[PDB]
Design a protein around this nucleic acid. Structure first.
Ligand SMILES: [Mg+2]
Ligand SMILES: [Mg+2]
Ligand SMILES: [Mg+2]
Ligand SMILES: [Mg+2]
Ligand SMILES: [Mg+2]
Lengths: 100, 212
RNA sequence: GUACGGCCGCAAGGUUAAAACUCAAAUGAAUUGACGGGGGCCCGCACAAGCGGUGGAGCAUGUGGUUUAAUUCGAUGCAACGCGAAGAACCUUACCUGGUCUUGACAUCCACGGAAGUUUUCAGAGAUGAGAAUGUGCCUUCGGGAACCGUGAGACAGGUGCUGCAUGGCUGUCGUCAGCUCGUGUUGUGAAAUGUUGGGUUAAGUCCCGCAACGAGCGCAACCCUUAUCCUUUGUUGCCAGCGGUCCGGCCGGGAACUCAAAGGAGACUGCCAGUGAUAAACUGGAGGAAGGUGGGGAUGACGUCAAGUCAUCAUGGCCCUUACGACCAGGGCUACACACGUGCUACAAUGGCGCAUACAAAGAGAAGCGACCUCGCGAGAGCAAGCGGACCUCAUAAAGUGCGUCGUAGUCCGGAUUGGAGUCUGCAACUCGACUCCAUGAAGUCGGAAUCGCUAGUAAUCGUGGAUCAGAAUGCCACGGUG
RNA sequence: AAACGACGAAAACUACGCUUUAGCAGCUUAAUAACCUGCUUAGAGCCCUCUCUCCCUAGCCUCCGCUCUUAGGACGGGGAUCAAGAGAGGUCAAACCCAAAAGAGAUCGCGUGGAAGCCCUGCCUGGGGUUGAAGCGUUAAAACUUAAUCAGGCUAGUUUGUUAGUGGCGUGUCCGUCCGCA
């Protein structure tokens, strides 16, 4: 839960949610073979000097409440230690200890 | 660190939940954070009125917060407008339209939090810790309860060594899966440090489980 | 019980028997714990019995040491060492190297000014400096307001820095082992004892009897979750018992007997007959029964022990740094190494590999998604791309099995690692550092000392599939069924 | 190496308190009693807050969003005060709570048939596309249509290719007869 690391992660979202269209169209163009070599090279050179830390696959999924950089779960958006205390208190509509 | 948390095992038998709306793997982290924020704001806004439980619901993109307290006079205020005034701020916090409900408890000394409260207050105002403990025990026993186990950890009576002490009157089962075990925990802040207060309350045998 | 003194005795010594000086104790009977190289009984794959494995050999992360700039933090006998880490190319993650800073990257605050803002121009790898093209988004009395930027400090930040010998919370072990206590009464002047002990019995302080014990709490079981026979309800995306057309496909016409789907129940309780046992509890057979003695599996971990482990999820009383331990991004290193170790995958070849018909599972995940086809590629997958928050579509012709052939005991048509090159998935970028692919060299190894570990039934052992982490990167982790 | 035990016998909100009534329970031979208790309700003592008993008005409402307007009901608007009684409650209000509207009906927003810019086209002529830029129309309509017309001074003869003077710091700081770009 470091304050220094808690701002870079939100920057990596507030900047990656803005370049969605340009990056999508560039990926489509450079992925479709029906293009021109000079245009593709210019596009990739323009893409690479875009801010580095704004890439979608350049941020580790950080926990919501405590920001633990390991064990992040898609279902709850929380780490194991916090989902334990959440499901134990009973705030998760349906989380009961189980037995198959 | 030895006993299992009783609420997490009594969730699916008798004890109701505190959040049971419907989300799909996308907004529950946000819903959980909103619930935590509204609860922590409610605690700070009603630190004087004895408040025990807060339940949340989300029917059709709208948030409902139900508070179970014993002093609704402070929260209601004169002319019955402070409830709406704070509903405004909780709606602002939650974003989606909000509504609140009050479930004032008659004779609430059997509530875990409200029976673990005001003893923290006596310890803060330096009333004798043994007097506070025996008063809490007698107050929890006089209302017809069948057993209260409250655990006190850390500097009993503003001491200098974090010790472990616990009283037990009546019977307080922990392995029976039909016994209503109301459990909670609170903390007391004093000039010498912090003290922990954990309370289990055995209501009695409840057969049939849910659906009354 | 010593010296002197008297007596006795050959002697050894015996007998009578002090004083000076030191201390506030020296003791005996009994009780509770503890301990014994004291004893007895009982229990658990604890031994035995078995069956498979680990030390022998590629490889994988992990551990100690070494090197290194760092080889990022802790875990250190069971109870750390495929641990946190449910997946380190940069980002990452706290370590290292160069450069920018100062109420700072991120928190409330005043004096005001600009709507916030979108595209590009440039110097620098970058850290962030200059700036232009621009926009004036909704609103009170226009000594303007919310929102967002900008500056000036001071009211403030920040710390994955340490202290788990201040702690909360959490977790593991003893240990699902069976004990740990209390109320009253009784006994002994009393500390204390009884209950809790003793025989049967059990998984048990489980049940019975006797006994100054009688009861109660935490406790052992049950109440909680699935499986095993049967009942009813609802019949779609499923079934075709019977009937019909039929493109031979359940396609529908139909239906709710069934398998399946989720809701409520009957149901195994020593209930029985016989023996044993104390005319008990119980144990053993047998009968019914789908199941029999707890019917079969899982959570639930009793008072307490280990200054047990984490101030590195988090919070946290004190020290602490306040122009740097706070903070800035790029490149490296966490992945390295003459070594030793825990664990596992991979093989030793005739029950075994090579290929060609061919078969039966459960449960799962799916919209920045799951992703049928088709055109292709010896192969990875490329292009085009239907359907689907899904009893509808995908992942996903599962294998072991089976019938054939084939090889013939050989470093092997075994074993699949190292090597040069080739593309592919993937994320801005795979020299450090991914995985997949297939052509090519085709290592080691041929059941492995002392030791040593796991299992008592649908379990060992084998075969494949599924799930979470995540741009991809599982021999690790968690589950699922088949054989047996 | 350490570890004492003293005073809710200095009940710390009254939850309005304050009064009182039946039973229960801890107490023990069985009971009572204090209260040790909570616990169903009774009534008013006693401070109370709100809607009231005042009058005026017939207000009044609700499906269509507006309307004279329709069975109807629990429906109900302003002004000073309260004499004594009555409902609730206790620093009490949203939701929980109890059942709703009959029709007419302009229809404003909401969708227009001949045209102003963007399509060869960077100034601008394009009817071949179009917008509320023009007739118009109810809970809806008298349908209707942002792309494909060749080509112009269309960045303007010197910017595309011959080529020429000095309205140039040219060159290691350089004055330097000169090499070389316009
Ligand atoms: Mg403290
Ligand atoms: Mg002598
Ligand atoms: Mg015995
Ligand atoms: Mg039987
Ligand atoms: Mg990733």
């Amino acid at each position: 839960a470091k304050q220094s690391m808690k701002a870079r992660e939100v920057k990596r979202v507030a900047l990656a949610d803005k370049y969605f269209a340009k990056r999508a169209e560039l990926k489509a163009i450079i992925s479709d073979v029906n293009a021109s070599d000079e245009d593709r090279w210019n596009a990739v050179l323009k893409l690479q000097t875009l801010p580095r830390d704004s890439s979608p696959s350049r941020q580790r999924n950080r926990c919501r409440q405590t920001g633990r950089p390991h064990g992040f779960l898609r279902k709850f958006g929380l780490s194991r230690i916090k989902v334990r205390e959440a499901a134990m208190r009973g705030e998760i509509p349906g989380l009961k200890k189980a037995s198959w | 660190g030895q006993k299992v948390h009783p609420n997490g095992i009594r969730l699916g038998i008798v004890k109701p939940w505190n959040s049971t709306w419907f989300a799909n793997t996308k907004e529950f982290a946000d819903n959980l954070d909103s619930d935590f924020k509204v609860r922590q704001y409610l605690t700070k806004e009603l630190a004087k009125a004895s408040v025990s439980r807060i339940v949340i619901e989300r029917p059709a993109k709208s948030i409902r917060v139900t508070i179970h307290t014993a002093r609704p006079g402070i929260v209601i205020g004169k002319k019955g407008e402070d409830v709406e005034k704070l509903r405004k701020v909780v709606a602002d916090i939650a974003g989606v339209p909000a509504q609140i409900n009050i479930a004032e408890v008659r004779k609430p000394e059997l509530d875990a939090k409200l029976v673990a409260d005001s003893i923290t207050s006596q310890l803060e105002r330096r009333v004798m810790f043994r007097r506070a403990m025996k008063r809490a025990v007698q107050n929890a026993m006089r209302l017809g309860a069948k057993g209260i186990k409250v655990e006190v950890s850390g500097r009993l009576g503003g001491a200098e060594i974090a010790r472990t002490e616990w009283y037990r009157e009546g019977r307080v089962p922990l392995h029976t899966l039909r016994a209503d075990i109301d459990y909670n925990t609170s903390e007391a802040h004093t000039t010498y440090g912090v003290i922990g207060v954990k309370v289990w309350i055995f209501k009695g045998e409840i057969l049939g489980g849910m659906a009354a």
